[PDB]
């Protein structure tokens, strides 16, 4: 398709346009706002026919698309930062009612530190809600994930909402080359939304009746089984996306120079691209370093990680977040990667790096200091403290 | 176009709220649901923000609505309704459904309409969605065990406002009057009315008149709660009527800046004739009652109820 | 593994009552005898059936007792599965309610009633492992107390045992001797009423008698997202006919067919027919609203146990 | 002092009464409501002098006590279930402004649909917010944690809010024996609340300005340091609470029959007391089984767990929650315990048991089956799947 | 008690909102804050729900208030102030502070007052806290880059309501009138007024009248935004005056069910004399302007402005 | 350390300073013109607006940036150009009170849109440090937008791209070439010119700060001025209309009438616009030394 140099915001909007979304609900918060601004223009200029609902806030945004998804509309909304936490109540009702709502999150820190830049903290607060979730690291991937998450989420085997996440500023604003698909491609990839229940007076259903505790375990387990089936469907979607669009995504891990790497940095989102640039430079110096970027955060690829990343001497885990009080005092990725690789805990050394707090750039130098810590850990086979908060501690 | 109902004789026989629900014997909100469902007919979608008319009606894994129904958070009834309306408009316009545009009705408790659900209500009216928003008002957070809400009358005993020597009246605060709150400042708002299960035909007619508007409508329905207000299960209708006869609740339509009173009364009974029949007020002293009377007098004057207050022989 | 976790010295009391109008007294019976037993160094636990909450007017609700000499190891449960003492705060509960499910041999059934022991037994049918039936006219001795206090685990501002809970519990002690009548007297607000219950309570020994769903099926029964189809004429998920302490009886010679009753029934239990109003006894809760609004005197309320059916 | 048979709700209210709280903000939701009903009676009867503010919802509750704490009041509020998630936006502002708000959480399964039964899912959604957090398993401990958490949280080295959690119904409603402290004990234990900032026109301060981009990482790290300082203060508080009240709590782990145990079950809250009873009975059969009840969830006792729990052949982790999509498909406790014990992963077998879903009882028989599974794991040295969802899978 | 101000020359000299803040040149809300602070005096606590008057004023790690101030979420301005008031009430009663009871003032933007902050505002009025809640209305979510709010006029161009062939007017919805929404049904409400920076002594007097009441007050203040409305930085006061002179904004006090009009003249200017100076209305056709006029006429009739509409020239 | 390890030798940094809201397109159109002309020569380029300066405010000094390299750019994420080779000013007053020469690398070129002499400009600048050239262009007359003439002056002095390549991308080539030949270029004698631990110690408890007493030194706004208010006290009646309408509290009442605080005044011109007596006049800021 047409190749354009565009922001992640505008890339997401084209994905939403191509998916022919039926109901959108807007509200402003930096840095995701531009997504809705572009969609508002697209509706005003007739490039997309959708009901464009001015939500009174983020809680309402999610509530509006809850209602619309139950009435059979394909729906889109999004937010950032404290907007993500303000809408928290509604995430579980959406998932538990099996409504494949898509919500874009362009990351913004919570309050405090406030309105400047990104942390993954906001979206990671949602990691229990029963949603598909992953981070785009480029504007192109931002568009592609929009389409892929609609296809996987709305598949009648799944019927689960999705968080299509992208780094604030670093993906949402920074321009990048994006191959925009054409309508014929998307129509072959993305069938129209069809749920197993819908609000329709011709076929009346009662959606969400109160249950007693004894009904709790069956229904929770039912959703669990839906969650556990996502990976298979996502593999199929990634195969079809490669076939139809010509871009081949790994469903779980974007690996770079891991073939004979002895240490890698593991993490997600845009800062991993910076990690790759550092890795290549260190490789030219003869360092056997590599990078594994997590493409799919929920459901977590426990077994795929166990299988594909247990061959390294040391893994440094980047958490661009402030997950306070968590086991091992890094962030969430460190705890979940260790849980995944637990059987290899004696051989595969792991350590967490917390950096990019408050939207700071994770710089080439900081990554250098990360790879150099891993090099040391690999040689001695010992980890001194389970986390380093950069740049205060490393 | 839903037609005027002339009388009980000419009321629809059809029930769209059927037997079988874990509501109290004598439940006023249950009767409200029955009458609203009866007036609305089959081309209707209900939205149920968490409260008795959600929990009591669907306990457990079932429900009494013949028409579609969906659960809403108590925080977001108005927004869920906005989405369903928007979805139907878009789906019909984009030709992805052959369904006709339905009645769309929120059944919010007083908490979910005047307190925690107010913001979502106001926004729905602002956006002008073709939705009827009903408040069924039992004057407490009832399903949680009878706790004070903004519609709970001055002086009422609830588990959050127990009478005691530091707070003799139990509840010190006078109630928010939600039908007047939302009646102003929302240009899209087509119709506002108050109703009561005591006057079922009046109620059903207001529901239909609200539905007939092309745009948002708000109906606030008085629904006595024998459990919460502590009166016998077979006194619910008498309580409803006495609420209006004492002016504790006013029945009207508010259209184009004017109040049109729905029920003619030549005399207004003193509020004590109403309050004495409910144990939620049993702790109150004469001076407390007099404060209630003054409040009600002002409330009545506000809507043009100018008749004298006259003690009954009974 | 039921035997491995058996508590041989543990007795289970299940108290049935009518929601809202008798829930406080059921709780007080339950609070009374555990407060009494605890004065004798026993291990005790009082709770209300949480699943029965919130209580609704006339729905059958429950309160439970577990008193023990050995520390209680079955605390964090919702209900007594195998009762040794079943108490009925209201008499109509012998109709349409599983009040004898799981009772253990040598059990006692105490009934708040003014009717004969024979009559109650006429309704119960097979009493299984029940060994004692006890009647006590608690409504002659004290009142059924109603309060907004004491709900959802909160302390009761009216205290314990001012109402019919006192004489009922007194009859329990007469039945089982589960605690000393003096210790019960110490923990109730109305020892007099209790003492009349203890003194005036008829006991009869019953004639000699001889004595679950899997996880797979549970899940199999749960529909997609818990969503269900709208009912067509009735909601069989909640059949409410067994809430009745009374029912509406019509004299059709007096009926005007004004259908005032019909328009005010909260439970859609009246239908207009060419025979006049027809009252749905599968669901009718006996609220009495129809009787209260009838202008002709065609309708009256009659106690549920004046009927065999 | 006086011993009474009271619910966890009333126990908490006595703790609040004894702490002489200045501002309380109420709102109803089963099963925590009884806490506010008792406090309301206490206020109306003159047993406690406090502003009793009728919140319009849980977001408001947390916002009211945020404001009151900044004005120098000791504050209290609480909730359950979707009330916890509705107030989500406010937790980070409270922590980040170092206001030692205490929130009581009586757990309840999140929507959908409506379900009054408990899961720890609700409070676990808050695990990143920078709060002190732990589960009481009895009404006595519910009272005691109320006092301890005010002590620790209000300490001028800490100044962090606290979630005093207790199992819904099982602790909140079911009556238990409670030794109620008298005023003199509390006065010796709990100093008056004094923060480093306060709204006072005589000494004007600007609380929460927009900080410059470069100051994000130091503000985050500053709070991280405060979080990392909590444990030492909690250890001191437990020591003083033993001396003053005569009840000695472990700051981290409530251990039962672990000295010679080959396998243990690890978890938190009321259901762990059931686990103890099952363990005692199995000991009669000859089984060397034990129980470790986690008393402090945040900040997580990583190194304390690593040190004290690494001596077992197998650990079964109970998660009474639905943390969907999490690494290893158990719940949060399995992931964080494995992260803490990572170094011993070749030797210390771990598996997750998910039960008590939707408020269902975790039965003696279900604990029997968990212990039987751990015995097999200890014998075989094999974990075949990392989690079992009871009763569907085990 | 805070005294009535008779004139500009007799206005207070003291500034409690001082030079130094990252607000636009000509910023209407900045002037609003200055005048409110001047009127309120030193025994005052400010609550700032997220928006320009928070972000622009505290950039970075500082602030222009001589009195104490605290950040609130845009969602909870009313609730945060409720808690500050409850605290002072309790602390004073329980003899744990010797501080005097302060002026407590919320400075919410229109987003934070009429849209996402409304529920918390209404609740604060219901509970009857002694708090002055102010909305500074710049008729958009401004700090986020100018997006439609419910006070955004019909036909206004914002990044969420751009004009286009499908939606020619840009914004099709007419605004919510928040001072009338909260003026009814709240028994504890002591005082409601609308103000404008065009009439700065009137503004400060209304603030003082609000503060003087023992209980809740709401003042809705028109504060033109040259960035968001697109007009020159030195026309902010002209814009404010024209808003009132055309009836696009009504100035009054509402008490005992009656409207006391603050500025009473013999004529009203056509709305076009106001709209044509702002590029946020540049796209509108005559039929759109006529819709605005009919709306404004209805709004003026509502408060009893019955003078004829007369072109200036 | 890793200076040379991740160094980008072939990369040129361009910083364009403007007045917020009113000229934030002049700034952007300049960085777009130069990069579209460089991407024509086969260079790797990036052009963006300073996220740090958002949201922009009327007259606040804001920045647009350009990166031009013959190698792929690996510093894409970096918010700001820290070491600019070319500093470009859209409005002349920006030569006063603004750190436009911070981080400048040797061989750098300062371009200014102005009619004033280079000598006058240098008086305002003072120590230009590593600055090699100082360039003046009267783009305002050439736009009579100004992006093209200013872009022309940039090329003429630096030769970072070709004239015709810029001509193919500018919206007005005529005004571009005019000023490419009229830009007065002048070479200078180009002489030479905070730990995380320190950052941490600087951050107060919870970020809370004391209230100011008379002024907020955290945000000094005098350098926003394009113009300042000048009073004629022979016309002034001391009515203090100006005083009560200043949104920045920059006017004080005295015995001699209103006094204007130039440390903070933003030159919004409201005081001038509200004066009943016409005693105030807006006057260009560079007309004054202080
Ligand atoms: C729950 C929530 N949602 C969005 C924002 C973002 N946000 C801002 C931010 O993050 O700094 S500033 C702003 C604008 C609010 O508009 P209004 O209340 O009208 O004030 P003003 O900016 O003065 O127009 C918004 C909307 C937020 N902070 N919190
Ligand atoms: Mg209610
Ligand atoms: Mg309609
Ligand atoms: Mg605004
Ligand atoms: Na006041």
């Amino acid at each position: 398709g047409k190749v354009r140099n565009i922001s992640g915001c505008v890339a997401v909007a084209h994905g939403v346009r191509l998916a022919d979304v039926d109901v959108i609900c807007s509200y402003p918060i930096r840095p995701y706002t531009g997504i809705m601004s572009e969609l508002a223009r697209m509706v005003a200029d007739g490039e997309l026919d959708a009901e464009f609902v001015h939500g009174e806030g983020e809680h309402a945004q999610l509530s509006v698309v809850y209602g619309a998804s139950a009435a059979g509309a394909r729906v889109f909304t999004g937010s950032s930062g404290v907007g993500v936490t303000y809408a928290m109540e509604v995430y579980s009702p959406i998932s538990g009612e099996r409504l494949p709502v898509q919500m874009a999150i362009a990351d913004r820190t919570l309050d405090p530190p406030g309105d400047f830049g990104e942390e993954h903290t906001d979206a990671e607060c949602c990691r229990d809600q029963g949603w598909i979730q992953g981070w785009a690291s480029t504007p192109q991937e931002a568009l592609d994930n929009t389409l892929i998450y609609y296809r996987v989420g709305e598949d009648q085997r799944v019927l689960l909402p999705q968080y299509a996440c992208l780094d604030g500023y670093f993906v949402s604003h920074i321009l990048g080359p994006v191959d925009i698909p054409d309508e014929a491609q998307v129509k072959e990839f993305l069938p129209p939304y069809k749920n197993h229940h819908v609000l329709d007076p011709r076929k009346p259903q009662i959606i969400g009746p109160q249950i007693e505790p004894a009904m709790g375990p069956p229904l929770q387990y039912q959703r669990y089984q839906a969650v556990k089936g996502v990976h298979k469907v996502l593999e199929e979607a990634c195969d079809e996306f490669a076939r139809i669009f010509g871009r081949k995504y790994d469903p779980y891990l974007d690996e770079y120079l891991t073939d004979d790497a002895e240490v890698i940095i593991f993490g997600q989102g845009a800062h991993m691209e910076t990690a790759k640039a550092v890795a290549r430079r260190l490789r030219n110096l003869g360092e056997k370093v590599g990078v594994a970027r997590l493409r799919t955060f929920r459901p977590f690829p426990t077994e795929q990680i166990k299988e594909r990343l247990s061959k390294f001497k040391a893994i440094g885990v980047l958490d661009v977040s402030a997950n306070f009080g968590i086991s091992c005092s890094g962030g969430v990725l460190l705890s979940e990667l260790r849980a995944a690789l637990y059987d290899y805990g004696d051989k595969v050394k792991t350590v967490g790096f917390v950096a990019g707090l408050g939207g700071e750039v994770v710089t080439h130098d900081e990554f250098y200091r990360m790879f150099q810590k891993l090099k040391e850990i690999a040689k001695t086979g010992k980890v001194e403290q389970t986390s380093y908060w950069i740049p205060f501690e490393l | 176009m839903l037609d005027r109902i002339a009388s009980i004789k000419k009321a629809p026989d059809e029930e769209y709220y059927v037997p079988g629900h874990r509501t109290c014997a004598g439940c006023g909100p249950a009767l409200t649901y029955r009458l609203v469902a009866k007036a609305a007919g089959p081309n209707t979608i209900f939205i149920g923000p968490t409260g008795c008319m959600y929990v009591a009606n669907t306990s457990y894994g079932c429900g009494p609505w013949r028409v579609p129904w969906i659960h809403a958070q108590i925080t977001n009834g108005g927004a869920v309704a906005s989405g369903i309306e928007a979805a139907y408009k878009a789906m019909i316009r984009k030709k992805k459904t052959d369904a006709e545009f339905p009645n769309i009705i929120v059944m919010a408790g007083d908490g979910g309409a005047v307190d925690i659900g107010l913001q979502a209500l106001s926004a729905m009216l602002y956006r002008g969605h073709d939705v009827l928003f009903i408040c069924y008002d039992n004057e407490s957070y009832a399903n949680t065990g009878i706790q004070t809400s903004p519609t709970t009358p001055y002086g009422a005993n609830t588990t959050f406002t127990p009478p005691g020597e530091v707070v003799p009246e139990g509840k010190k605060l006078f109630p928010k009057d939600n039908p007047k709150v939302i009646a102003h400042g929302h240009p899209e708002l087509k119709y506002v009315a108050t109703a009561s299960i005591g006057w079922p035909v009046d109620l059903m007619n207001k529901v239909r008149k609200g539905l007939n508007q092309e745009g948002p409508a708000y109906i606030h329905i008085h629904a006595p709660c024998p459990k919460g207000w502590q009166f016998p299960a077979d006194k619910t209708i008498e309580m409803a009527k006495l609420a209006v006869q004492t002016g504790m609740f006013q029945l009207y339509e508010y259209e184009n800046g004017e109040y049109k009173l729905s029920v003619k009364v030549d005399k207004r009974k003193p509020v004590s004739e109403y309050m004495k029949l409910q144990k939620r007020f049993a702790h109150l002293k004469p001076e407390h009652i007099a404060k209630m009377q003054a409040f009600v007098d002002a409330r009545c004057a506000e809507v043009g109820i100018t008749v004298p207050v006259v003690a009954s022989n009974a | 593994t039921k035997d491995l976790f058996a508590e041989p010295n543990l007795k289970q009391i299940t108290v049935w009552a009518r929601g809202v109008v008798m829930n406080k007294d059921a709780r007080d019976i339950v609070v009374a005898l555990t407060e009494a037993a605890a004065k004798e160094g026993k291990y005790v636990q009082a709770w209300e059936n949480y699943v029965d909450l919130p209580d609704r007017i006339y729905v059958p609700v429950r309160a439970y007792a577990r008193i023990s000499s050995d520390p209680i190891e079955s605390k964090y449960i919702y209900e007594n599965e195998t009762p040794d003492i079943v108490v009925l705060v209201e008499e109509s509960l012998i109709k349409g309610v599983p009040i004898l499910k799981g009772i253990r041999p040598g059990s006692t059934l105490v009934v708040n009633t003014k009717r004969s022991i024979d009559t109650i037994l006429e309704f119960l049918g097979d009493t299984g492992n029940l060994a004692q039936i006890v009647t006590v006219d608690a409504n002659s001795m004290a009142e059924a107390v109603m309060t907004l206090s004491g709900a959802e685990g909160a302390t009761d501002a009216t205290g314990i045992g001012a109402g019919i809970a006192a004489p009922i519990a007194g009859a329990v002690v007469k039945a089982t001797g589960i605690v000393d009548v003096e210790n019960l007297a110490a923990v109730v607000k109305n020892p007099a009423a209790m003492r009349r219950g203890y003194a005036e309570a008829q006991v009869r020994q019953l004639p000699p008698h001889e004595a679950a769903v899997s996880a797979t099926e549970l899940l199999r029964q749960m529909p997609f997202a818990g969503t269900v189809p709208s009912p067509v004429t009735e909601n069989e998920g909640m059949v409410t006919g067994n809430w009745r302490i009374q029912r509406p009886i019509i004299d059709r010679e007096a009926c005007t067919e004004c259908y005032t009753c019909w328009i005010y029934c909260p439970d859609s239990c009246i239908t207009r027919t060419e025979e006049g109003p027809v009252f749905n006894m599968k669901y009718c809760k006996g609220c009495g609203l129809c009787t209260a609004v009838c202008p002709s005197g065609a309708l009256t309320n009659v106690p549920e146990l004046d009927f065999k059916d």
Side-chain angles (χ1 to χ4, degrees), chain B:
Chain B
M1 177 65 184
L2 299 171
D3 294 324
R4 247 266 302 187
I5 303 167
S7 67
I8 287 171
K9 185 179 68 169
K10 311 290 274 290
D13 274 279
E14 288 74 25
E15 305 293 344
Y16 287 98
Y17 176 82
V18 304
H21 35 92
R22 197 180 180 267
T23 51
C24 295
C27 181
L31 177 59
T32 301
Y33 229 132
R34 176 182 165 222
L35 298 172
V36 167
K38 175 180 285 296
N43 188 23
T44 299
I45 299 171
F46 281 111
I47 296 89
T50 314
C52 274
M53 292 302 100
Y54 160 52
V55 176
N57 280 314
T58 56
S59 307
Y60 287 102
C62 62
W65 308 285
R66 277 174 78 188
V67 306
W69 172 98
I70 186 162
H71 174 238
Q73 306 308 101
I74 194 178
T75 47
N76 71 6
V80 172
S82 297
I84 299 169
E85 193 259 7
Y88 264 83
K89 279 185 155 48
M91 291 297 278
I92 288 170
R93 181 176 67 248
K94 295 172 73 168
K95 299 168 182 177
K96 299 181 180 186
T97 187
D98 48 347
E100 308 181 40
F101 189 73
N103 296 319
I104 300 171
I105 303 177
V106 183
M107 285 289 283
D110 43 292
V114 327
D115 202 27
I116 200 176
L118 175 57
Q119 187 156 290
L121 164 58
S122 176
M124 181 197 80
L125 309 175
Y126 163 68
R127 284 186 304 263
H129 299 277
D130 194 352
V131 169
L132 170 59
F133 191 110
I134 299 175
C135 173
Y136 70 92
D137 190 353
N138 58 18
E139 290 179 3
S140 86
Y141 285 94
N143 196 77
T144 40
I146 318 309
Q147 290 77 32
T148 184
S149 86
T151 70
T152 303
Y154 162 78
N157 192 347
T158 74
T159 85
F160 280 6
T161 55
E165 62 178 24
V166 176
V167 192
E169 56 263 83
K171 176 163 191 278
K172 336 181 190 71
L173 293 167
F174 290 83
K176 191 192 302 190
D177 189 4
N178 213 51
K180 298 200 179 58
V181 173
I182 51 80
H184 304 84
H186 298 86
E188 293 285 333
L189 180 56
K190 308 297 185 190
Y191 182 68
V192 175
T194 59
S196 164
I197 58 179
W199 287 257
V201 170
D202 175 75
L203 184 162
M204 287 188 293
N205 278 331
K206 285 169 177 172
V207 166
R208 292 191 160 182
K209 186 174 178 188
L211 288 171
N212 287 334
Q213 312 296 335
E214 285 198 344
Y218 180 82
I219 303 175
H220 195 104
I221 304 177
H222 206 222
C225 173
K227 174 180 172 180
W229 303 5
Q230 298 183 114
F231 61 78
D234 61 351
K235 292 283 136 279
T236 303
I237 303 312
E238 178 174 356
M239 222 59 57
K241 290 186 168 173
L242 273 167
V244 174
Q245 291 169 344
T246 60
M248 283 283 276
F249 194 92
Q250 303 87 44
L251 296 184
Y252 60 81
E253 295 167 292
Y254 179 79
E255 292 178 83
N256 308 128
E258 299 191 12
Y259 295 99
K260 176 187 188 301
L261 296 171
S262 301
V263 168
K264 63 99 63 179
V265 283
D266 307 320
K267 299 172 301 184
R268 186 155 52 85
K269 302 175 175 175
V271 302
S272 54
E273 301 191 11
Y274 166 69
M275 299 171 73
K276 67 191 273 289
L277 305 176
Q278 324 165 45
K279 290 185 187 175
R280 66 170 168 166
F281 297 123
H283 59 284
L284 290 183
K285 298 312 169 192
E287 50 270 42
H288 299 142
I289 301 293
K291 282 183 63 181
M292 180 74 73
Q293 188 65 63
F295 178 67
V296 171
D297 288 339
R299 281 285 215 99
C300 286
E302 184 177 23
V303 296
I305 299 172
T306 58
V307 298
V309 175
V310 177
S312 302
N313 307 329

Side-chain angles (χ1 to χ4, degrees), chain A residues 86-254:
Chain A
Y86 175 45
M88 191 74 173
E89 196 203 350
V90 191
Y91 298 138
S92 175
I94 288 161
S95 174
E97 292 301 338
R98 304 287 291 280
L99 308 167
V101 170
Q102 183 170 130
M103 172 184 192
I105 297 185
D107 294 311
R108 197 271 221 169
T109 51
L110 300 187
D111 295 342
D115 203 29
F116 176 61
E118 72 139 357
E119 278 174 14
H120 294 178
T121 306
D122 56 352
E124 287 169 346
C125 289
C126 309
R127 66 192 176 273
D128 303 314
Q129 301 306 302
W131 287 50
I132 303 170
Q133 181 168 8
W135 265 262
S137 66
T138 59
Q140 177 78 73
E141 184 169 47
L143 190 154
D144 297 345
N145 273 358
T146 295
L147 301 177
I148 293 164
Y149 280 4
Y150 273 128
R151 156 146 178 160
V152 175
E154 294 181 356
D155 190 286
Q156 284 203 324
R157 292 168 290 174
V158 180
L159 289 162
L160 288 171
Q162 329 89 49
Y163 298 116
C165 303
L166 62 150
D167 297 70
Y169 183 71
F170 305 116
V171 182
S172 65
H173 285 58
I174 291 174
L175 268 53
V178 176
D179 189 336
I180 307 170
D182 65 82
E183 287 70 5
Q185 282 173 299
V186 182
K187 297 306 175 185
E188 188 179 343
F189 177 74
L190 182 62
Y193 169 42
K194 291 295 176 183
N195 209 316
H196 289 313
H197 55 195
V198 66
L199 300 165
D200 171 12
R202 294 168 300 174
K203 184 71 166 182
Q205 294 174 289
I206 292 168
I207 296 185
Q210 177 94 18
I211 62 165
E212 65 178 87
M215 308 182 177
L219 187 52
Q220 292 291 53
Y221 187 71
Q222 182 188 102
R223 183 148 48 124
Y224 174 61
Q225 289 295 270
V227 168
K228 296 299 288 295
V230 169
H231 286 165
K232 180 69 247 296
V233 176
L234 175 65
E235 293 178 0
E236 304 176 359
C238 285
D239 284 341
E240 275 302 272
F241 197 95
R243 183 180 73 75
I244 299 173
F245 301 90
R247 287 184 297 286
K248 175 177 176 61
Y249 291 99
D250 190 283
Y252 311 108
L253 299 163
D254 169 34

Side-chain angles (χ1 to χ4, degrees), chain A residues 41-92:
Chain A
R41 184 199 62 72
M42 283 172 175
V43 175
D45 288 346
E47 302 173 6
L48 173 64
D49 184 9
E51 207 78 346
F52 193 86
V53 185
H54 304 165
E56 66 270 27
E58 290 90 351
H59 189 284
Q61 279 183 288
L62 275 295
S63 306
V64 168
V65 293
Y66 169 95
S69 179
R74 176 174 291 145
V75 305
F76 176 78
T77 191
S79 193
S80 305
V82 292
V84 175
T85 51
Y86 175 45
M88 191 74 173
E89 196 203 350
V90 191
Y91 298 138
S92 175

